[PDB]
């Protein structure tokens, strides 16, 4: 974040370390020597335009890429930072339900041995694309005045690298914040209600208690299924939970207390909680996230330089291309402090089904209610045909001679005498003929 030349990721020591790109090309005017001569190498490089251009392009491109890439891989954001995108991604999640185990029955087993498991529910990824360049500049006098000694070259290279990479770190942090904002905006976070932690000390203590309760309930050994984008019954270990807390909020709470909410001690937390000032999404305060939830992949990291003969200067272009993916099966909590409605969003089990012309499918709805009250779900079919009817329990029955595609709809009402408030979940059902 404040890189100096002493951060030597690769190669041996001493400034004379690089000074060899002449081998790969050139090495007829620069002395291939490792000594105290600094004027000779400067004169050899500075002879003409061709030698200048070759040396500058090589040093800027290859060493710059190596240095910044090997420095940006150990930033405090390395936890969610993975390598190059794999081939054959298929842009699809595949998670299997943690079901129970059948009882051993010889009579039942002898009846059928070719049965298959339930569908795994294959939902797509949530991704965002990142593209940009930073575009710094080199003046000609810098090369002239950077060869007086063996430390000026160090200062010049380190100045370039530090001038570029610091802005990239800030953009990475801002992109993480923007992704969290967008995910909350689409409403897939499971909200937990808190009220004005910064207002009073009692509010802060109550927020800490709710923090601890949610973190303890997320890490239940037998699974939860409550906190998810869809009911899948996963389980998250305590050592993987990540906390994204607003800066002014985090300032008030001590490092402790919030530390003892989880089960490790202080030092093991500074790499498990990031601080971002301002969410700008109604009343978002803090977000509790499984380490798997956020995943970033990188595609392109390339330098190219251009030379302007009229102005005697060179340019810069770091092209950083990334695909920030969001998983929909990892646990996620919103922890919003506002006036959110009683029911945020309902989720329909078997979202995708392939029912025959005479079969049936059982659907269940999971209401995500912020209060302790009970809400009833009214099922509907939409679609449009004769003979297709769904029961009050969600059991859909398909009649013969049908060709349209049905969309099971689950609706809840949290309104009043006037009802401009509908929370609806959709399940797309495809039909196959017999």
């Amino acid at each position: 974040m404040r890189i100096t030349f002493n951060d030597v990721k690769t190669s041996l020591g001493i400034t004379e370390s690089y000074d060899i790109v002449n081998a790969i090309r050139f090495k007829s005017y620069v002395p291939l020597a490792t000594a105290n001569n600094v004027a000779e190498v400067g004169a050899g490089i500075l002879i003409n335009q061709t030698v200048q251009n070759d040396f500058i392009t090589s040093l800027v491109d290859r060493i710059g890429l190596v240095v910044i890439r090997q420095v940006s891989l150990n930033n405090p954001l390395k936890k969610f930072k993975k390598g190059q995108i794999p081939l054959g991604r298929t842009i699809e999640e595949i998670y299997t339900d943690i079901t129970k185990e059948k009882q051993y029955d010889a009579e039942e087993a002898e009846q059928k041995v070719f049965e298959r498991e339930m569908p795994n529910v294959k939902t797509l990824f949530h991704e965002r694309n990142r593209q940009g360049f930073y575009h710094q500049t080199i003046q000609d006098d810098s090369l002239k005045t950077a060869f007086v000694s063996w430390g000026n070259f160090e200062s010049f290279v380190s100045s370039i690298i530090n001038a570029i990479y610091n802005s990239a770190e800030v953009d990475e942090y801002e992109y993480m914040k923007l992704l969290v904002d967008n995910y909350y905006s689409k409403g897939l976070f499971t909200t937990v209600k808190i009220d004005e932690p910064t207002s009073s000390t009692g509010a802060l203590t109550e927020f800490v208690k709710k923090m601890r309760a949610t973190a303890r309930k997320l890490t239940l050994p037998q699974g939860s299924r409550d906190w998810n984008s869809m009911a899948v019954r996963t389980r998250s270990y305590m050592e993987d939970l990540h906390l994204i807390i607003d800066a002014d909020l985090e300032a008030e709470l001590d490092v402790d207390v919030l530390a003892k909410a989880f089960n490790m001690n202080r030092t093991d937390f500074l790499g498990n909680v990031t601080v971002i000032d301002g969410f700008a999404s109604t009343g978002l305060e803090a977000v509790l996230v499984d380490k798997d939830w956020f995943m970033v992949y990188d595609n392109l990291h390339k330098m190219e330089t251009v030379r302007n003969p009229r102005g005697l200067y060179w340019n810069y272009y770091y092209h950083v291309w990334q695909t920030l993916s969001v998983s929909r099966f990892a646990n996620a909590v919103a922890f919003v402090s506002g006036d959110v409605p009683a029911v945020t969003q309902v989720i329909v089990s078997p979202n995708i089904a392939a029912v025959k012309q005479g079969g049936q499918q059982q659907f269940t709805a999971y209401v995500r209610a912020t209060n302790a009250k009970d809400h009833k779900v009214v099922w509907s079919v939409e679609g449009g045909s004769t003979g297709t009817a769904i029961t009050g329990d969600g059991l859909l029955s398909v009649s013969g001679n049908e060709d349209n595609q049905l969309t099971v709809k689950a609706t809840v009402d949290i309104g009043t005498e006037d009802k401009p408030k509908l929370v609806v979940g959709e399940a797309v059902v495809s039909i196959r003929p017999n």
Binding site: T10, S11, L12, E16, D19, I20, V21, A23, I24, L32, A33, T34, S58, R62, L65, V66
Partner: peptide
């Protein structure tokens, strides 16, 4: 690529 891709005959 690493640093080694640019060979150094002046290493020793």
């Amino acid at each position: 690529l690493n640093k080694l891709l640019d060979p150094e005959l002046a290493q020793s």
